[PDB]
Amino acid sequence: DIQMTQSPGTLSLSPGERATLSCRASQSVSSYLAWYQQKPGQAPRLLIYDASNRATGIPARFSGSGSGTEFTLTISSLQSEDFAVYYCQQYDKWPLTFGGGTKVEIKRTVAAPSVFIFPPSDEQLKSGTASVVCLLNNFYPREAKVQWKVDNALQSGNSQESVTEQDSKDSTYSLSSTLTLSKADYEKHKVYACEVTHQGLSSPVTKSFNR
């Protein structure tokens, strides 16, 4: 089964610049090569079929080329909209086979997180346990440490973080940690800190509250 293989795998480019992605065939595929774009979470969009041939109503910056076993899709002016995975797909012999995707991320300028903190809510407490939410909003780039503390105690019990998809507008990400402890324990402690390290910050940042 002609097994397809997409070259870079990830790609971070600043908007404005040219983007170049590869699709290598395990044996010759000739001209028969589709290219798809998948923004999240929606339906893959055909961009290019036959390697050379741009689908209707697709913007001109997208083009594809190559032939035989080496193929390249090209975004002449990367642009903030274009953050997605790009799949190439094979169709020379049966069965139909796809690439792995190259995720394309839009490198923008340093943006520091505005950090907020949300205590538990009473109602939640009524039913057994307590979540303390820590929001990090609108930063770039994506790496961010977040530790929790409880009366200055370093926790390793127990948060779960989650980050959003790059904004198509301003290319920034948001994150949210959730310290989760039983109501029993929440009452055992006086101060609730979350501390954030991020490249766009000169030094780290705490957000706390008491009770």
């Binding site: 169709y91 909003n137 989650s162």
Partner: protein, 220 residues
């Protein structure tokens, strides 16, 4: 304005069976070879099966051969996937797509529908309020949201003020509680001043358990 519209997803017992439709509005369905394509999470695209315009010719991936049947109703304008004997690895988003003339790339795609193959049961979400607070506020802008624990399966939907408020919003990816349930936050940054005048309602909608719920978020 050509679109395929899938529906028929959700939770299935292992060993069971389930079917989905890719109803298609914009074009002359009846002449188009159609096909079904799934994608397990943390993996990519895999064809599942293909059907002739004829309706009379089908082909099948070797994972699903003899177990799944692709099929169409031209007069009803609809594509079906009757899946039998499901396994936890069948968990995936299923898209159906239509075949482009000359032929074998996929012209047009539906949005996807997630089938979660687990013998765990549906549990409706609990919606709690992330109140806007002196400690949730920054300048002329203020952060609020709804926290959504604990639910199973993986798809929930949150909109603000019934879709009236759509930006400032970020509604985060769920995380799989050590429980084996899920939890997510949704969050909108709104104009400081409005905290008093305007009123914010998040509308959570989880279909697997018909659990629908609003939550008036209010400051303090």
């Amino acid at each position: 304005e050509v679109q395929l519209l899938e529906s028929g997803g959700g939770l299935v017992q292992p060993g069971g069976s389930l079917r989905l439709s890719c109803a298609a509005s914009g074009f002359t369905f009846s002449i188009y070879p159609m096909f079904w394509v799934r994608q397990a999470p943390g993996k990519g695209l895999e064809w599942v099966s293909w059907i002739g315009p004829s309706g009379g010719i089908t082909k099948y991936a070797d994972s699903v051969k003899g177990r799944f049947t692709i099929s169409r109703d031209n007069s009803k304008n609809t594509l079906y996937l009757q899946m039998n004997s499901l396994r936890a690895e069948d968990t995936a988003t299923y898209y159906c797509a239509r075949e482009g003339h000359n032929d074998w790339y996929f012209d047009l795609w539906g949005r996807g529908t997630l089938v979660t193959v687990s013998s765990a049961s549906t549990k409706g979400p609990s919606v709690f309020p992330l109140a806007p607070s002196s400690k949730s506020t920054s300048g002329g802008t203020a952060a609020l949201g709804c926290l959504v624990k604990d639910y199973f399966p993986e798809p929930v939907t949150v909109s603000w003020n019934s879709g009236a408020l759509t930006s400032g919003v970020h509604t985060f990816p769920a995380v799989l509680q050590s429980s084996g349930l899920y939890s997510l936050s949704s969050v909108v940054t709104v104009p400081s001043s409005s905290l008093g005048t305007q009123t914010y309602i998040c509308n959570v909608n989880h279909k697997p358990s018909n659990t629908k719920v609003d939550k008036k978020v209010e400051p303090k």
